[PDB]
Amino acid sequence: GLKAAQKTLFPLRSIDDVVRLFAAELGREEPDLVLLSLVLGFVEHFLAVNRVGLTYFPVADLSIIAALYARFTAQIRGAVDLSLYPREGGVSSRELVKKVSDVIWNSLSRSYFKDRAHIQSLFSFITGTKLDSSGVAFAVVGACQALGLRDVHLALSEDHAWVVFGPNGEQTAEVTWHGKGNEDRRGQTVNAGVAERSWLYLKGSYMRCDRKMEVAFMVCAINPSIDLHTDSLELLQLQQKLLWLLYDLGHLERYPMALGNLADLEELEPTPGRPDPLTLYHKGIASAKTYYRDEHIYPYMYLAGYHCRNRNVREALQAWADTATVIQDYNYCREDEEIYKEFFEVANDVIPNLLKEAASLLEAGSQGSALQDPECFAHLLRFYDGICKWEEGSPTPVLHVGWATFLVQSLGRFEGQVRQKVRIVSVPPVLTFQSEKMKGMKELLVATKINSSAIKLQLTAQSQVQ
Numbered sequence: 001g002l003k004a005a006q007k008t009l010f011p012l013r014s015i016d017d018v019v020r021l022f023a024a025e026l027g028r029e030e031p032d033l034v035l036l037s038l039v040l041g042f043v044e045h046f047l048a049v050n051r052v053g054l055t056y057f058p059v060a061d062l063s064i065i066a067a068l069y070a071r072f073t074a075q076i077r078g079a080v081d082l083s084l085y086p087r088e089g090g091v092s093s094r095e096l097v098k099k100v101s102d103v104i105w106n107s108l109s110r111s112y113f114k115d116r117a118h119i120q121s122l123f124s125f126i127t128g129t130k131l132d133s134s135g136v137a138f139a140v141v142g143a144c145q146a147l148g149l150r151d152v153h154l155a156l157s158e159d160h161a162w163v164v165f166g167p168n169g170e171q172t173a174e175v176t177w178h179g180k181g182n183e184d185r186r187g188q189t190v191n192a193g194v195a196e197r198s199w200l201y202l203k204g205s206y207m208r209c210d211r212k213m214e215v216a217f218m219v220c221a222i223n224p225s226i227d228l229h230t231d232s233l234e235l236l237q238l239q240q241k242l243l244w245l246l247y248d249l250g251h252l253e254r255y256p257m258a259l260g261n262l263a264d265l266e267e268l269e270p271t272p273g274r275p276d277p278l279t280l281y282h283k284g285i286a287s288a289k290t291y292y293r294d295e296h297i298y299p300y301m302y303l304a305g306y307h308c309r310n311r312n313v314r315e316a317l318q319a320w321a322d323t324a325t326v327i328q329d330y331n332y333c334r335e336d337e338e339i340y341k342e343f344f345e346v347a348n349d350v351i352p353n354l355l356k357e358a359a360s361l362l363e364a365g366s367q368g369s370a371l372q373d374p375e376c377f378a379h380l381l382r383f384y385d386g387i388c389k390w391e392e393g394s395p396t397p398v399l400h401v402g403w404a405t406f407l408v409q410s411l412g413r414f415e416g417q418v419r420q421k422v423r424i425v426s427v428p429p430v431l432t433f434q435s436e437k438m439k440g441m442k443e444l445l446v447a448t449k450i451n452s453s454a455i456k457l458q459l460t461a462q463s464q465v466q
């Protein structure tokens with residue numbers, strides 16, 4: 001409408017008033033996505049984009065939120081004539097979904113930086129005619145709800161978004177773009193992507209949201225950044241309380257990334273009486289294991305990041321090894337570049353810098369160093385093993401000589417007497433390698449003096465020398 005009951009909480013004068021609105025909406029049949037996204041975008045705008053005049057919290061008046069809401073619903077209802085797309089069965093058709101997609105897409109400014117902060121909400125759509133990639137998918141779902149299309153829902157992989165709809169929720173449709181320089185496939189299914197076993201489509205173990213998970217997504221999408229080195233305390237606190245509200249009601253049960261985002265917020269500013277960040281990261285991993293066949297990479301990356309920030313080197317190495325153990329059962333495809341970048345940065349910047357400090361500290365006389373622990377060496381090896389296995393059978397390679405230099409350097413941070421204590425066992429501290437690259441390397445991993453050239457040859461499969 002809005003409906004009279006959704007209006008009684010206004011004006012919203014504080015973070016806790018916003019939380020009350022979310023709690024009210026979540027206690028309804030169908031939480032109103034359009035309402036909730038407009039409200040979050042309004043409060044983010046005036047807490048992060050333009051704080052001129054700010055004295056405590058940007059008061060969200062009904063009259064303002066209602067006009068924005070009428071702007072959206074009028075644009076959608078005026079442009080989508082439902083009479084042209086009859087619904088057999090309380091479910092939508094592909095043509096109708098495509099039409100809603102076209103409507104949102106065609107409303108967007110023709111040229112803008114698609115990567116800016118704060119263009120994720122319906123507030124940005126209405127006031128700036130700008131949305132980021134997943135923001136367009138969310139807007140399509142909001143628009144569908146506003147039209148009464150109960151069956152259309154958000155689907156999320158770790159780096160892309162689209163919709164599901166139709167008989168039993170079984171149809172997929174692309175509704176937004178992915179990446180840059182990939183021709184879009186808007187209107188099509190995601191079955192080619194699932195079938196090629198790319199990371200982008202998670203071998204089909206992607207999230208299929210209900211309305212409550214869609215609210216969780218908009219909460220994760222809050223962006224507290226004011227600039228490069230400055231976050232809004234107000235938005236961090238709002239995001240955190242909203243995530244706890246969603247947690248308590250059970251709606252983060254099937255959402256690993258949201259649990260990782262909540263753990264990150266708790267690391268930054270812990271809520272008394274709540275679970276530790278670690279407990280939360282592990283719940284993230286448990287959710288991925290329970291609902292998505294343990295096919296998600298970020299639950300382990302979140303955990304590794306925490307361990308890396310706190311210099312638990314052994315635990316960070318184990319969590320990164322576990323990331324590699326997930327990626328190994330994917331094919332590296334065109335459009336998976338975001339995950340290559342994450343692995344590249346870990347291998348080639350983060351781990352070398354961690355091990356460099358570990359080596360200084362060891363010279364200083366640290367006891368129980370990761371560099372003296374052959375289980376740490378084993379995690380390092382398992383990490384490279386899964387990246388090598390990932391590459392096997394993929395339609396493009398992963399490894400090149402730029403990776404070999406870092407490999408050699410990281411191996412050399414462990415003394416030969418530490419490296420020799422890892423037992424590498426065949427199928428069909430002990431480690432088994434899955435990749436042919438690392439199996440051929442086993443001989444080289446123990447020498448007192450690492451044979452650098454030979455390692456390079458083995459990792460890149462370079463056939464010849466100068």
Ligand SMILES: N#Cc1ccc(OCCCN2CCC([C@@](O)(c3ccccc3)C3CCCC3)CC2)cc1
Nearest residue numbers: 134156157158159160161220221298301302304305
């Ligand atoms: N070591 C280490 C490490 C590395 C990366 C890392 O990344 C955590 C952030 C993961 N990132 C996933 C994509 C995600 C997102 O960009 C996204 C998620 C799902 C589909 C599309 C986009 C947003 C979710 C809310 C709005 C979009 C933002 C969070 C953490 C630790």
